[PDB]
Design a protein around this ligand. Structure first.
Ligand SMILES: Nc1nc2c(ncn2[C@@H]2O[C@H](COP(=O)(O)OP(=O)(O)OP(=O)(O)O)[C@@H](O)[C@H]2O)c(=O)[nH]1
Ligand SMILES: [Mg+2]
Lengths: 189, 114
């Protein structure tokens, strides 16, 4: 209605909303905690959701981190609306759940409210020797067969904060390009 | 237009205090589901969406007590387009900010405790 229409016909150019999802124990909350450079020890599995509003390259990034515990996944959709970028986090060492991680990601991509989102995949926990390579994870999840969304896979280690920023920088640029593209076709036709 | 008139009533409806009572009576039903922690509960969301629907609906009702032929969509469409904004829309935006909504709720809870 009036209230929600008002909100988007009013968001400022450089406010972006990012939804971070993934299986429980993937390291979602560790990752955004590291972004601010908040300490990340004493982190507990999320039963609800965390909101952390950022600042990066002139952008205010409002990041929503939703618990990935299985009994919670049906509520993920209450957070789909107004997502400029979807961040899918993966525990690279969690080899036995790669299929479910795959199933979960796939159902998100046919979701209508997520039609526009840029997809960033964080193959987290690369610091673990049992961690599958990004390529192996790209193979599983069958990312190469996604043409509905722009995506990229970034191997990282939230615990050390290694490679998180390059992931985010790719995501912001892709989001910017999409908006740029839309504006282009709007003013011309 | 008939527009500038509605913009006037909004200020009158929300900055009235039947509205503030509406808000309190809503919070009375849920205030103790709200915890003072940084992590939010999933249940805050449906309550939040219920709140938004309630405010939006109290509006349209009060607005047609004014102009009995007020069509929300017509005003919204005409707004969601070519009369594009102000000073009270800023308070209107307030209702959709989840973080402030939560704080509104938290201050209320502490108040109710005592
Ligand atoms: N070795 C290693 N452990 C990590 C890494 N990132 C996170 N962890 C740990 O993995 C465990 C789970 O991390 P979380 O951030 O709670 O994962 P989550 O997806 O937010 O969990 P949910 O809230 O259930 O969704 C914690 O003990 C983290 O410290 C990493 O990069 N390497
Ligand atoms: Mg978490």
């Amino acid at each position: 209605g009036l209230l929600t229409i008002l909100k988007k016909m009013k968001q400022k150019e450089r406010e972006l909303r990012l939804l971070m999802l993934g299986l429980d124990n993937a390291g979602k909350t560790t990752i955004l905690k590291k972004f601010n450079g908040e300490d990340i020890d004493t982190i507990s599995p999320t039963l609800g959701f965390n909101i952390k509003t950022l600042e990066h390259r002139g952008f205010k990034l409002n990041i929503w981190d939703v618990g990935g515990q299985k009994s919670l996944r049906s509520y993920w959709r209450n957070y789909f609306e107004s997502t400029d970028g979807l961040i899918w986090v993966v525990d690279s060492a969690d080899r036995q759940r790669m299929q479910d991680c795959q199933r979960e990601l796939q159902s998100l991509l046919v979701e209508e409210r997520l039609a526009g989102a840029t997809l960033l995949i964080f193959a987290n926990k690369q610091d673990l020797p049992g961690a599958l390579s990004s390529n192996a994870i790209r193979e599983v999840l069958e990312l190469d067969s996604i043409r509905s969304h722009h995506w990229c896979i970034q191997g990282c280690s939230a615990v050390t904060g290694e490679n998180l920023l390059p992931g985010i920088d790719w995501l912001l640029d892709d989001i910017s390009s999409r908006i740029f593209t839309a504006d282009l076709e709007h003013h011309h036709h | 237009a008939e527009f500038d008139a509605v913009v006037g009533y909004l200020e009158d409806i929300i900055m009235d205090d039947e509205f503030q009572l509406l808000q309190r009576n809503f919070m009375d039903k849920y205030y103790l589901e709200f915890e003072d922690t940084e992590e939010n509960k999933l249940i805050y969301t449906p309550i939040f969406n219920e709140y938004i629907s309630l405010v939006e609906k109290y509006i349209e009702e009060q607005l047609l007590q004014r102009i009995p032929e007020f069509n929300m969509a017509a005003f919204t469409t005409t707004l969601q387009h070519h009369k594009d904004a102000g000073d009270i829309f800023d308070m209107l935006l307030t209702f959709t900010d989840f973080l402030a909504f939560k704080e509104m709720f938290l201050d209320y809870r502490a108040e109710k405790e005592g």
